[PDB]
């Protein structure tokens, strides 16, 4: 068949399935990639938290949290905890432009989870609040 | 009774050609440099066309070929150039050998 990068539309019956589940039912891996930290949380389609992880929770502290390896470790831990609850396929929803933005996904892959879709939810203000002044460095 | 210059210009085949875009002309290969053929088609400037991959050796000096003209003179005006910059050659597509 012809693969389309566009996600299947909720409310429309698609042939695509994963473990006998529809795309609307696949659990959701929210990734937040800040400059100083990276947080990962898996939730069900019904917004039920199943696993959470972060660089700080994995023992890394201060500047060491900003490394990509910390985000990879967080992804590994989150994937292990989610897989303990039966999570197999996930939809990745990544926000922020932190160093671990991709590494966390790799960790999930290393954790055993299968990523079927990558979604960017970076909060981009359509001319919203005023950011802080530029650093004089 | 001698024909005037105006009459010659009016009845010239080049004048009758109108615009040179996508017109079909018969040119002559008057020079060959490796796989580059220089073809004169009765215009002010010749045109350089690559030797075709098929029947390339069949093109030689004096061979008559069919050309689809794109422009008699290739000129362009750049940023700050007070006058147009020309490459002193035409732009044509080499359809292939022409047989009488």
């Amino acid at each position: 068949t012809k693969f389309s990068i566009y996600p299947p539309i909720p409310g429309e019956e698609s042939s695509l399935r994963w473990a006998g589940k529809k795309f609307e039912e696949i659990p959701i891996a929210h990734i937040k990639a800040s400059h100083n930290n990276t947080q990962i949380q898996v939730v069900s389609a019904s917004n039920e938290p199943l696993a959470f992880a972060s660089c700080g929770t994995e023992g890394f502290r201060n500047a060491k949290k900003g490394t990509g390896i910390a985000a990879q470790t967080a992804g590994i831990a989150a994937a292990a905890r989610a897989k303990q609850k039966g999570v197999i396929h996930i939809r990745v929803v990544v926000k922020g432009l932190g160093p671990g933005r991709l590494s966390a996904m790799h960790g999930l892959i290393m954790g055993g989870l299968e990523v079927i879709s990558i979604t960017d939810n970076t909060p981009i203000p359509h001319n919203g609040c005023r950011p802080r002044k530029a650093r004089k460095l | 009774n001698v024909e005037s210059f105006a009459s010659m210009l009016r009845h010239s085949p080049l004048t009758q050609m109108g615009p040179a875009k996508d017109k079909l002309v018969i040119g002559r290969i008057f020079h060959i440099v490796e796989n580059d053929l220089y073809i004169d088609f009765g215009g002010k400037f010749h045109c350089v066309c690559r030797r075709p991959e098929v029947d390339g050796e069949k093109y030689q000096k004096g061979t008559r070929v069919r050309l689809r003209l794109l422009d008699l003179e290739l000129t362009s005006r750049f940023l700050g150039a007070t006058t147009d910059t020309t490459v002193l050659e035409a732009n044509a597509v080499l359809l292939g050998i022409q047989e009488s």
């Binding site: 996904m105 979604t119 970076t122 | 750049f78």
Partner: protein, 85 residues
């Protein structure tokens, strides 16, 4: 408020997560979202923003003109037809 998993969403093809992420990043870059976030990290004062935009427009115009000039002039980059003269 909008429906989710439609905007900025790329389906992973045959488990090729890296390729899907690359496609998503390229889409965001083409739409300028990545540069938008980078510029929105800190406030860019309006005079600075106007100067940068004008400089970018001038640079793009100059680059396009130079590319056109180079393409036009490279038509003469062939073997010398009158060597020895």
């Amino acid at each position: 408020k909008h429906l989710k998993f439609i905007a900025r969403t790329v389906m992973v093809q045959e488990g090729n997560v890296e390729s899907a992420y690359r496609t998503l990043n390229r889409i965001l870059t083409m739409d300028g979202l990545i540069e938008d976030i980078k510029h929105r990290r800190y406030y860019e004062k309006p005079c600075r923003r106007r100067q940068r935009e004008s400089y970018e427009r001038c640079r793009r115009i100059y680059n396009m003109e130079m590319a056109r000039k180079i393409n036009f002039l490279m038509r003469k980059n062939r073997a010398d037809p009158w060597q020895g003269c």
